[PDB]
């Protein structure tokens, strides 16, 4: 048990050190909503200006997820190729999961570049259905009321997936995965939160949306 | 006249050396249309996989545009800051103009990753309005039947624009711009193609769409 409970600890600690934006900081800024003047400024930008801003933010978020993977006990031991495949396959899946921390379901806003704004903040993109899916996915995830410890373990499971294609040493990913799934269960039962397992999004929904 | 005509030559030669994809190779591949199986494969990908694909292709195209600017006589002489502002302001405008070369208006398809596909190739993006704009813009530009020499001069004009905000040494951009506009006119007149000037897209349309 001290084995599993130490895995839960190092996973959470690794998440703490790589969460990029602390939860308490995002909640303290909730009342800081973008004004209409500021929304129009975003809407007046060009399609390339908004596409490039979001690409930058996502690329920077992936780096933090790379560090999260680096500090998962056992991930560094996996072969180089398996490290690339797992990251390229699930890094952005973890970023989108992390994005729900920046989402406020009370008013349906998201933290972005200093303040909270709705979907209309991203109109210049021309990706209203994509953005709608991101808001909708975050809204459905917010209804789980994830703790930071639950996001730490859940995101680690999203990353360490033995089924990804291209994995050469599957069985050594299977081991690192089962330990994480069991750690997930131990922490959930010790906090009376096992009822959210049947509510998590399917492995497939994380992507196509 | 040998002064203007040599500017037309070095601009076209610079375009030739930086066109990335040669026109003859794009035309030779027009009959190579994506099959339905291959279209579904693109439509089954994840939102992040397609966004990541397109982002990579666009970034790589910008690099070629950077080289096109480097070889425009006088551009290197401009100050460092003015080089950054001009490129950041018009590099993607030149990429989108160049994209019409990969567009076939006979069947409304575009070359992408080895074959020609319609707008339904990008459905997984969730950016139907944006993509619709790239197709519509390319279709309107295809009706001009640009020669490669005309794209060389026109794109150089799109890049060298004295009106861009942030330009410190405007008058030295004005000089390099006037020479290019006059070169544009000389080549169009000597080829009886001056009638396309009244048909070019406005300076603003190149962006927001
Ligand atoms: C709703 O649309 C978005 N919402 C976002 C909300 C937060 C952040 C975030 O990166 C951030 C960090 C720091 C600051 C700063 F600087 F202000 F503090 N601002 C923002 C952040 C904070 N915690 C985690 N993340 C990731 C970025 C967002 C982005 Cl990029 C978009 C656009 C977008 C999203 C997804 C795809 N996509 C394409 C394919 C799949 N998905 C495309 C575009
Ligand atoms: C219609 O949608 C697209 N059509 C494209 C057609 C061609 C290419 C191209 O880069 C290329 C090169 C090599 C190969 C390969 F691999 F086959 F050789 N394939 C393709 C290319 C060839 N000549 C010039 N270019 C640029 C890329 C395309 C892209 Cl990215 C899109 C998506 C898209 C378009 C625009 C924005 N955007 C965001 C803000 C504003 N605009 C976003 C996404």
Q: Are B130 and A126 inside 8 Å of each other by CB?
A: yes
* Residues whose CB falls within 8 Å of the CB of residue B22, separated by 6 or more in sequence, listed in order: none
Which atom of ligand 1 is closest in space to residue A138's alpha carbon?
1
Q: Give the bridge partners for A110, in sequence order.
A: A103, A117
Distance CA A25, CA B3 (A): 62
Tokens of A74: 């056992």
Distance from CA of B23 to the nearest CA of A (A): 25
**Cα–Cα distance measured from residue A118 to residue A34, given in angstroms and rounded to the nearest whole number:** 9
Residue A30 to residues A23, A117, A120, B7, B122, Cα–Cα distance (Å): 11, 10, 17, 57, 35
For residue A111, give the DSSP letter.
Answer: E
Overall residue count recorded for chain B in this entry: 209
Ligand 2 centroid – CA B123 distance (Å): 14
B152: exposed, middle or buried (Cβ count in 10 Å: 0-12, 13-18, 19+): buried
Separation in Å, CA of A205 to nearest CA in chain B = 9
Q: Do A208 and B46 count as a contact with CB atoms less than 8 A apart?
A: yes
Distance CA B184, CA B195 (A): 12
Q: In a 3-state reduction of DSSP, which class is residue B137?
A: helix
What CA–CA distances, in Å, run from A81 to A87, A88, A168, B25, B58?
Answer: 10, 11, 8, 35, 26
CA pair distance A123, A51, nearest whole angstrom? 11
* Structural contact between residues A158 and A94, judged by C-beta atoms closer than 8 angstroms: yes
DSSP 8-state secondary structure symbol assigned to residue B195 = G
Among A101, A123, A105, A116, which residue's Cα sits nearest to residue A49? A123
Whether residues A48 and B92 touch (CB distance < 8 A) is answered with yes
B207 part of contact set with chain A, CB < 8 Å: yes
Resolution (A): 2.7
State which approach was used to obtain the coordinates. Answer: X-ray
Q: Which chain A residues contact residue B55 at CB under 8 A?
A: 51, 55
Contact criterion met (CB below 8 Å) for B43 and B120: yes
Asked whether the beta carbons of residue A207 and residue B126 sit closer than 8 angstroms, the reply is no
Closest by CA position to A209, among listed B26, B154, B137, B48: B48
Which residues are paired to B112 by β-bridges? B115
Check if the beta carbon of residue B74 is closer than 8 Å to that of residue B176: yes
The Cα B190–Cα B192 span in angstroms is 6
Q: What stretches of chain A show up as alpha helix (H) in DSSP?
A: 2-16, 23-28, 36-44, 47-70, 80-99, 128-142, 148-159, 170-190
CA of A89: which chain B residue's CA is closest? B49
Query: Among candidates A110, A20, A17, A116, which has minimal Cα distance to A70?
Result: A17
Rounded to the nearest 10 degrees, the angle between the axes of helix B148-159 and helix B170-190 is 160
Cβ density class B171-180: b for 16+ within 10 Å, e for less: ebbeebbebb
The answer to whether B119 touches B131, Cβ cutoff 8 Å, is: yes
Pocket lining for ligand 2, CB < 6 angstroms: A 47-48, 51; B 21, 54, 57-58, 61, 95, 98-99, 102, 110, 112-114, 122, 131, 134
**B34 DSSP assignment:** P
CB pair distance less than 8 Å for A126 and B126: no
Query: In Å, how far from its chain's centre is CA B205?
Result: 14
Nearest CA to ligand 1 atom 21: A99
Sequence-separated (6 or more) residues with CB below 8 Å from residue B188 = B150, B194, B196, B197
* Ramachandran quadrant class, B146 (left: phi over 0; alpha: psi -120 to 50; beta: rest): beta
Task: Find, among B160, B170, B139, the residue nearest to B7 by Cα.
Answer: B160
Residue from the list A93, A124, A130 with its beta carbon closest to the beta carbon of B125: A130
Compute the nearest-CA separation of A56 from chain B (Å). Answer: 11
Using alpha carbons, select from A176, A167, A164 the residue that is nearest to residue A204.
A164
Nearest-ligand number for the alpha carbon of B25: 2
In Å, how far are A20, A74, B8, B25 from B67, measured between CA atoms?
36, 44, 17, 21
Contacts of A93 in chain B (CB under 8 A): 48
**Contact with chain B for residue A66, Cβ under 8 A:** no
Q: What angle do CA A89, A90, A93 make, to 5 degrees?
A: 130
Strands of chain B (E only): list them.
103-104, 109-112, 115-117
Q: Are A197 and A188 in contact (CB under 8 A)?
A: yes
**What is the distance in A from the centroid of ligand 2 to the CA of B112?**
7
Among candidates B17, B29, B2, which has minimal Cα distance to B117? B29
CB contact under 8 A, A208 and B127: no
- Closest of A152, A104, A123, A160 to residue A40, by C-alpha: A123
The Cα–Cα gap between B155 and B141 comes to 13
Cβ-contact B4, B179 below 8 angstroms: yes
Long-range contacts of B24-27 (CB under 8 A, 24+ apart): B26/B101, B26/B102, B26/B111
Q: What is the spatial distance between Cα B41 and Cα B120, in angstroms, rounded to a whole number?
A: 11
Task: Using the structure block, give the residue that is written with the tokens 């030295």.
Answer: B172
Cα(B206)–Cα(B99) distance, integer angstroms = 12
Provide the angle, in degrees to the nearest 10, between the axes of the packed helices B170-190 and B2-16.
90
The CATH H-level (homologous superfamily) assignment of domain B1-209 is Retinoid X Receptor (1.10.565.10)
Query: Own/partner pairs for B74-83, CB < 8 Å, 24+ apart?
Result: B74/B175, B74/B176, B74/B179, B75/B159, B75/B160, B75/B176, B77/B172, B78/B169, B78/B172, B78/B173, B78/B176, B79/B168, B79/B169, B81/B166, B81/B168, B82/B167, B82/B168, B82/B169, B82/B172, B82/B173
Point out the residue among B48, B92, B128 whose CB comes nearest to the CB of A92. Answer: B48
Say how far apart CA B163 and CA A29 lie, in whole Å. 39
* 3-class state of residue A160 by DSSP: coil
User: What region, left, alpha or beta, does residue A173 occupy, with left being phi > 0 and alpha being psi -120 to 50 degrees?
Assistant: alpha
Two tokens, residue B39: 């279209």
């Amino acid at each position: 048990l001290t084995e599993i409970e130490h895995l839960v600890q190092s996973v959470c600690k690794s998440y703490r050190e790589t969460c990029q934006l602390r939860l308490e900081d995002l909640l303290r800024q909730r009342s800081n909503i973008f004004s209409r003047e500021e929304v129009t400024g975003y809407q007046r930008k060009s399609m390339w200006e908004m596409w490039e801003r979001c690409a930058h933010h996502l690329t920077e978020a992936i780096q933090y997820v790379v560090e999260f993977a680096k500090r998962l006990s056992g991930f560094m031991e996996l072969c180089q190729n398996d490290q690339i495949v797992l990251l390229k396959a699930g890094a952005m899946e973890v970023v989108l999961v992390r994005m729900c921390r920046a989402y406020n379901a009370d008013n349906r806003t998201v933290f972005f570049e200093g303040k909270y704004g709705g979907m209309e903040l991203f109109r210049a993109l021309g990706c209203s259905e994509l953005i709608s899916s991101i808001f909708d996915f975050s809204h459905s995830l917010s209804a789980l009321h994830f703790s930071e410890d639950e996001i730490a373990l859940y995101t680690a499971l999203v990353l360490i997936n033995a089924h990804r294609p291209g994995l050469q040493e599957k069985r050594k990913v299977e081991q690192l995965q089962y330990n994480l799934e069991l750690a997930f269960h131990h922490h959930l039962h010790k906090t009376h939160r096992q009822s959210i397992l049947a509510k998590l999004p399917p492995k497939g929904k994380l992507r196509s949306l």
